[PDB]
Design a protein around this ligand. Sequence first.
Ligand code: HEM
Ligand code: HEM
Ligand SMILES: Cc1cc(N)nc(CCc2cc(F)cc(C#CCN(C)C)c2)c1
Ligand SMILES: Cc1cc(N)nc(CCc2cc(F)cc(C#CCN(C)C)c2)c1
Ligand SMILES: C[C@H](O)[C@H](O)[C@H]1CNc2nc(N)[nH]c(=O)c2N1
Ligand SMILES: C[C@H](O)[C@H](O)[C@H]1CNc2nc(N)[nH]c(=O)c2N1
Ligand SMILES: [Zn+2]
Lengths: 415, 410
Amino acid sequence: CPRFLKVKNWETEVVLTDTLHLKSTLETGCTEYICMGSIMHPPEDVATKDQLFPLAKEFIDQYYSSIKRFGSKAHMERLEEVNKEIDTTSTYQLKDTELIYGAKHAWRNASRCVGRIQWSKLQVFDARDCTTAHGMFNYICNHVKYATNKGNLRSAITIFPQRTDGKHDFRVWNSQLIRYAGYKQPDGSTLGDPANVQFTEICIQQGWKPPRGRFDVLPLLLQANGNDPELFQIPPELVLEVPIRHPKFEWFKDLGLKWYGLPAVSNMLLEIGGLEFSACPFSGWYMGTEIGVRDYCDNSRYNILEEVAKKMNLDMRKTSSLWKDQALVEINIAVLYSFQSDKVTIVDHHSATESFIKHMENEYRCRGGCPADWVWIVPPMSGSITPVFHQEMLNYRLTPSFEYQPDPWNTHVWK
Amino acid sequence: RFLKVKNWETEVVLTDTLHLKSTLETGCTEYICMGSIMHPSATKDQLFPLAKEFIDQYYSSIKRFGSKAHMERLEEVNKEIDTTSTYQLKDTELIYGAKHAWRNASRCVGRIQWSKLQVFDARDCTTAHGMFNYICNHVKYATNKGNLRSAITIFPQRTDGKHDFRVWNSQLIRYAGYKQPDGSTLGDPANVQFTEICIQQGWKPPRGRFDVLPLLLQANGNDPELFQIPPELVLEVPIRHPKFEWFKDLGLKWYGLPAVSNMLLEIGGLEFSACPFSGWYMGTEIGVRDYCDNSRYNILEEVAKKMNLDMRKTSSLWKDQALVEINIAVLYSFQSDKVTIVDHHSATESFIKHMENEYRCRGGCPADWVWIVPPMSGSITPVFHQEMLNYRLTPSFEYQPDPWNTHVWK
Ligand code: HEM
Ligand code: HEM
Ligand SMILES: Cc1cc(N)nc(CCc2cc(F)cc(C#CCN(C)C)c2)c1
Ligand SMILES: Cc1cc(N)nc(CCc2cc(F)cc(C#CCN(C)C)c2)c1
Ligand SMILES: C[C@H](O)[C@H](O)[C@H]1CNc2nc(N)[nH]c(=O)c2N1
Ligand SMILES: C[C@H](O)[C@H](O)[C@H]1CNc2nc(N)[nH]c(=O)c2N1
Ligand SMILES: [Zn+2]
């Protein structure tokens, strides 16, 4: 691999030089012959002693380099203490400092995240002392209340105990901490969020009494130490919601739409120094298009374009009237207006992509690069009028990292 | 191995076997993906295997692989590479190769049309005047009084690199751009440099906002020469809006013929450095990129003014509102003037149908998601949710250096 790679911005002519890609670890999925850049996802199997030694050393070296203590006595002593741990116990425990550093860098390294200008302002909650699902519930409730902060949202992550043999995993079965239920009807229609029908049916099987509405917050389904998961209802006062109204169309409120304020991903795996944190829910704040374009206007989601177009009285007979595009904008205007009126942190796609360009440029200057997944970074509407559209990006995998993992109902051995 | 692609909206999975036939590089490695890089970075010995592969797939496509005609052509080509260091394609091979370079263009959402391509053989051309004549016939044929027809005109192949045929215009029809004294730019700012080369070569600019640039044509490595396309051959559409009567007052127009003339067509190891090809527009190419890119006509401000939109904060989405209206006007204008155009909903629809066709009859379809997804309203078009595999099949269209950086003037 060459030592310098150049990326160009085609709107501004700015050229940046990437050297950080020389630290890339795992595979992208691509080869010299095929690019998998648009592929979304390109047991008791755990790291062995021989696999763990170099992964820990690499991480510890990186941590001590970051604190300007590389080669120091504390660096060599930490390396020796970790090596002894992996020898006698075939794993090791991170220090609180290293845990915080690793989590912030997994975010910093997350190539699909447009919000990384905030990466160093992450509140890390250490929940490695948790033993039961009730305790996981307590930790998640605290996370939610802290991150929500009455609408002045703060980014946060709660980290449950790492994987040991793979048969004792901590898992949040929810894909996100706050989601709305989906219900398949006998006639084939769906009520609520069609994306969540499978998980909703799991919750119902596990004992959840479904209120069968359009916006029913799903219960938490929480697995501690490999045991069967347990259901808990998030106290509704901790779930901040925003009714969606429009600054011009008085009728928009009559659509009865709302959404929750806190985007909190809970199905990903956090890898730090070869250790695997299978339950690491993290939350930030929404970019408006995640709600106004994807949640509301995906055909397989709430799919409200038709109804909004009708109330806008648009010609829905020709696609070339762009009635869909026209209604999409008004929906996203309403979502941003509703969050701002209620003083709930949200960012529009223009501000967020401009901030990301400034972040990426800083990372190139200070760090030697910034891995970025153009397919995910560019917003799902108005792409070319945002600056990221015109920005060439390089995508590669740095560790610490957030990774996908199998859905736990596909792997869990029921007690 | 066999590679699978899923559509996340329909859950349709397709199976790709065609990728096993690629050989050119994508630009990526197992450790770095360059999928958003626009431009990632022959003797008798290099040439025959490339010729062999192309002839092999041609005779396979007409179902006479290993036939006597196939064997004789392989022999005829070898004897020709021996004695001339190159070879000439048969007419049937030229047409098949041009259609398949289009079929293989991973960045083109229009490929459902690939087999309906009119191929104009211009390999007997020797002068820039001859090139001008051929390009005029192309434009008239492809324009067809608004009922646009896909076409390509193929000039002589590269011989030594010193006698290249080149269309210096990046596209056959474009508007000039002029650097003003007061700093800003009149016309199309992407073309300021090319416009200045035309002026420097003697072109008398009208210094309007929509001045069709002259053709600048290079034959056989000679200095390029200027030619004015006769105006009755250049079809244009004044842009108006179905509801905003003030929209025509903006004074906007565009040309109907999109015609790429700066690319290189590779067929069986031969290089055609001048191969202008044309189709018809997708409306977003004009309404989003040409008019609303900050480095182009940059009219969002003005349109948002006349729409009276609140422009004091981005979260009003004033830019997004103005953008949709501009693209309504463009589609409405071309449709009213019966000039062929396709909106991004219909175009991406067709491309999904195309992909399914290609996976079934051919085992795959190389596609570049970064270029295929339209520059506006991405996720409400079906390609957004379609996984695509990108890989390089030959015959192909390739980028090449700009002629003004390589040409030694005479
Ligand atoms: C603080 C404000 C934040 C904003 C505005 C933001 C924005 C976004 C957006 C718009 C996406 C695309 C999501 C989608 O389309 O489903 C995304 C993805 C992602 N973000 Fe951020 N994010 C924020 C905070 C965070 C934090 C705190 C973390 C981790 C500690 C994080 C890690 C990620 C990851 C790993 C992805 C990829 C998700 C996936 O592959 O499904 N983000 N972000
Ligand atoms: C018939 C209607 C056609 C439509 C609607 C169409 C649509 C498009 C669009 C929207 C692009 C993106 C252009 C850009 O953003 O600059 C594109 C690219 C491309 N098209 Fe098609 N196209 C058509 C015909 C053709 C034909 C006839 C050929 C060749 C014979 C062709 C070959 C290509 C190539 C090579 C590219 C990539 C250009 C580049 O990399 O800059 N297309 N097409
Ligand atoms: C930390 C963070 C910030 C932000 N601003 N956004 C996200 C993603 C939030 C989210 C919410 C949700 F309800 C569903 C999904 C998803 C998904 C998977 N997708 C392929 C359908 C993601 C995370
Ligand atoms: C065959 C065809 C059909 C179509 N529908 N469209 C095209 C592209 C047309 C075009 C016109 C133009 F005037 C400029 C460009 C460009 C460019 C380079 N870009 C990276 C800035 C492309 C080609
Ligand atoms: C097939 C394609 O990769 C898929 O639709 C991706 C496209 N880009 C995306 N970008 C973001 N931010 N979120 C997504 O869910 C997707 N989906
Ligand atoms: C950096 C990025 O590759 C570049 O802006 C691309 C993105 N996608 C595109 N897609 C099309 N059709 N045309 C373009 O010019 C571009 N530009
Ligand atoms: Zn790639």
